Design a protein around this ligand. Structure first.
Ligand SMILES: Nc1nc2c(ncn2[C@@H]2O[C@H](COP(=O)(O)OP(=O)(O)O)[C@@H](O)[C@H]2O)c(=O)[nH]1
Ligand SMILES: [Mg+2]
Length: 174
């Protein structure tokens, strides 16, 4: 229980993109295919060293994020980070990224650090979203960017640590 900050980081994007498995990989180094999940919303935690600061990352996840729900407001409330995940082998999951941003900014504060994540990079042979295209989008929209694989661990820790360093930088100036 050595930590100085608690950072709430929510995972968002279409179902099937890998959000639950980015959580499990980062927090438990685990990867399932059909994940046992509780009803509604959950989080898992991981303490991370940022230089000499101890930060407790609170990673939030759910299966039904969906604007009609009463719970959406509470889900986003107090979030200082977000990973907006798409499946790089499914163009459709990336085509709705703008819509997810809008949903996110209706409920999160503008200071939230957002990373656009292209997941399933181990399947880059079957890619439908050029890295360059996704990268420019993120730059035009004030989003950090990375491609990850929750399956092969590529960039998962880096994804989370980059968001967390950006949050810490930011909140130090608040
Ligand atoms: N090849 C590959 N499959 C993945 C990856 N991440 C998740 N999956 C699979 O995609 C499916 C959905 O992933 P899940 O974590 O439940 O996504 P969620 O619906 O966004 O929470 C499951 O079969 C996962 O095992 C990845 O990085 N690579
Ligand atoms: Mg899930």
């Amino acid at each position: 229980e050595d930590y100085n900050f608690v950072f709430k980081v929510v995972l968002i994007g279409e179902s099937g993109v890998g959000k639950t498995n980015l959580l499990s990989r980062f927090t438990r180094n685990e990867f399932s295919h059909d994940s046992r999940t509780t009803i509604g919303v959950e989080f898992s935690t991981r303490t991370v060293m940022l230089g000499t600061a101890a930060v407790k990352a609170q990673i939030w996840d759910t299966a039904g994020l969906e604007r009609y729900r009463a719970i959406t407001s509470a889900y986003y409330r107090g979030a200082v980070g977000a990973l907006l995940v798409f499946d790089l082998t499914k163009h459709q999951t990336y085509a709705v990224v703008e819509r997810w941003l809008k949903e996110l900014y209706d409920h999160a504060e503008a200071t939230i650090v957002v990373m656009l994540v292209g997941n399933k990079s181990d399947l880059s042979q079957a890619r439908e979203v050029p890295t360059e295209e996704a990268r420019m989008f993120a730059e035009n929209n004030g989003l950090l960017f990375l491609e990850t694989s929750a399956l092969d661990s590529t960039n998962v820790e880096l994804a989370f640590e980059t968001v967390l360093k950006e949050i810490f930088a930011k909140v130090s100036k608040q």
